[PDB]
Amino acid sequence: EGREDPQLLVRVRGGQLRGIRLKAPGGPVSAFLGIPFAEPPVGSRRFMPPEPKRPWSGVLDATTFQNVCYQYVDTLYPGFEGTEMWNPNRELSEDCLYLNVWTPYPRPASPTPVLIWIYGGGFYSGAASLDVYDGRFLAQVEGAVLVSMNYRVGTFGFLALPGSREAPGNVGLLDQRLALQWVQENIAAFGGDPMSVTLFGESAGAASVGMHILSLPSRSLFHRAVLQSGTPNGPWATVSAGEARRRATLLARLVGCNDTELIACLRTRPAQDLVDHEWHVLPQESIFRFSFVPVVDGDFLSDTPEALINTGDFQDLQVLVGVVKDEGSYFLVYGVPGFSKDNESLISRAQFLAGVRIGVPQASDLAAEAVVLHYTDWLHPEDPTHLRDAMSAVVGDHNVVCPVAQLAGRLAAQGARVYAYIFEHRASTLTWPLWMGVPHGYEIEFIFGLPLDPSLNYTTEERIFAQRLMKYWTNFARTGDPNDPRDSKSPQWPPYTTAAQQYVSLNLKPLEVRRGLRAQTCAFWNRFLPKLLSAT
Ligand SMILES: *[C@@H]1O[C@H](CO)[C@@H](O)[C@H](O)[C@H]1NC(C)=O
Numbered sequence: 001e002g003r004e005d006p007q008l009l010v011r012v013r014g015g016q017l018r019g020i021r022l023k024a025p026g027g028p029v030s031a032f033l034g035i036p037f038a039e040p041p042v043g044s045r046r047f048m049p050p051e052p053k054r055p056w057s058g059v060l061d062a063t064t065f066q067n068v069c070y071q072y073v074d075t076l077y078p079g080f081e082g083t084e085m086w087n088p089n090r091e092l093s094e095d096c097l098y099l100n101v102w103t104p105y106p107r108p109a110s111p112t113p114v115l116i117w118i119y120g121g122g123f124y125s126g127a128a129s130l131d132v133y134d135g136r137f138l139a140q141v142e143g144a145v146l147v148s149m150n151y152r153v154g155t156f157g158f159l160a161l162p163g164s165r166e167a168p169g170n171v172g173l174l175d176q177r178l179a180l181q182w183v184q185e186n187i188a189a190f191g192g193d194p195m196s197v198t199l200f201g202e203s204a205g206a207a208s209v210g211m212h213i214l215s216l217p218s219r220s221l222f223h224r225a226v227l228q229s230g231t232p233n234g235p236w237a238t239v240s241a242g243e244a245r246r247r248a249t250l251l252a253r254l255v256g257c258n259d260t261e262l263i264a265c266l267r268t269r270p271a272q273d274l275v276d277h278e279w280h281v282l283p284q285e286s287i288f289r290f291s292f293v294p295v296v297d298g299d300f301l302s303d304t305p306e307a308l309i310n311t312g313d314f315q316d317l318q319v320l321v322g323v324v325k326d327e328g329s330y331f332l333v334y335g336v337p338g339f340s341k342d343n344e345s346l347i348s349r350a351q352f353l354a355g356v357r358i359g360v361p362q363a364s365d366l367a368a369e370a371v372v373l374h375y376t377d378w379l380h381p382e383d384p385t386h387l388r389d390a391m392s393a394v395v396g397d398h399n400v401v402c403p404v405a406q407l408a409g410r411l412a413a414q415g416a417r418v419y420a421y422i423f424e425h426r427a428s429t430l431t432w433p434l435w436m437g438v439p440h441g442y443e444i445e446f447i448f449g450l451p452l453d454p455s456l457n458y459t460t461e462e463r464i465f466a467q468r469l470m471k472y473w474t475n476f477a478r479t480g481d482p483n484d485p486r487d488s489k490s491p492q493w494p495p496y497t498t499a500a501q502q503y504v505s506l507n508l509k510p511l512e513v514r515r516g517l518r519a520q521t522c523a524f525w526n527r528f529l530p531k532l533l534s535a536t
């Protein structure tokens, strides 16, 4: 060193790092990108739980985002920003277990509360390096310490032969957990407070956060959790051990393959062979269903998340949870006939019934009849616009809104302090059609404060709105409460309770308190459907 910038050299358990001074709108931030955190889970290590990064010598350069975990790359709409923005933006590799830290510049004087972001992408895609996960705005404007990590997705992260030694399952969750430990051990070197760690995540990121809550060894690694548009409970976020074994041995067959020999063979396949077949192992034609997800192994997850949230004590827990206005619309273009981004997607009643068998793949004929009956508007049963929106609502309600509603309810009933929102603002810069409303994933760019970036063409009220969201999120990280102690009456954001079931609306207008999270309809999905399904 010597001519280097003195505010960018930091030491962590594995060695010395050199970070980078980054420009944010209102001033500079410190960034430490591509910090190892684990031994490259390649070769004989594929499908295996991660081992801690062996210490290096010299100064590790931490000025750029590292590899993105090997994954399927989306090409439904080549060149279209709306899809490309979620695509990998660094080389795909199995050597991908790296994490990133953003902090104020110079780094904080006192210990600062830490936010840990866990990306979503259905457990088959994702990266902590995407522009919408840029932690520099939260670091500069809120003085937060923001951390985000890569974890293995798809087969690499979730293929399981439960019981086995060489593919125990859930290793992607283990990847996340090791980064949590890493933060405990090392974040003090950046001015972070290991005693104020808040998890937040979206979609499969939210379901991930949720599983850390329900898994003892993770519980000591963080203090508060934010779950955006996802839950550990619900139809897509986990598979039984039987079903995971089924999918693993089927995929093994499709690529050309006693657990040990099976896995040993899989370990000799190019990573792209695994990706090319991972979608061919699903039981039914489906949307919002992913081949390789967290498995109920009786280990990381001691029981189903349903059983765990039903019988757990969450006195210690403060949680923020929410959903967007149109959770389901995004997935319709990815496998429901009639639906496209290039037209208004007005569908027929026939395409609706067909769409329901796809979005509720596990339903008997009677179950599918119930759904179609519930969602049909009997004043206008054949109206193409209503059917289009009912289809979107079916998918949204079954997968997110009702699992979220049920999650808030059980956690509040059992000690947790829970805050709940519905995010209702459609970004002015959105490239998906209007019929999709506010799709899944589109609050993220507001929470991370992207609209503060002059060159982004957000409106001024969008910029002010982003500052509010950043405030709510960072206050909650700081205190377990979204509300500003200073700022009095905006109005206040009330905890969610079984009694009153209040949540707030997040949009350009001020906080408005509403009651009941699709209460009537969630009773269908959460109380009736299960019983109907178990009697058919
Ligand atoms: C929109 O496009 C899809 C796929 O190309 C097609 O199946 C559907 O019928 C179209 N919808 C309308 C309203 O024309």
Ligand SMILES: *[C@@H]1O[C@H](CO)[C@@H](O)[C@H](O)[C@H]1NC(C)=O
Binding pocket: 455, 456, 457
């Ligand atoms: C913002 O608007 C300007 C003016 O039309 C345009 O030149 C620029 O490319 C826009 N930026 C983005 C990425 O939307």
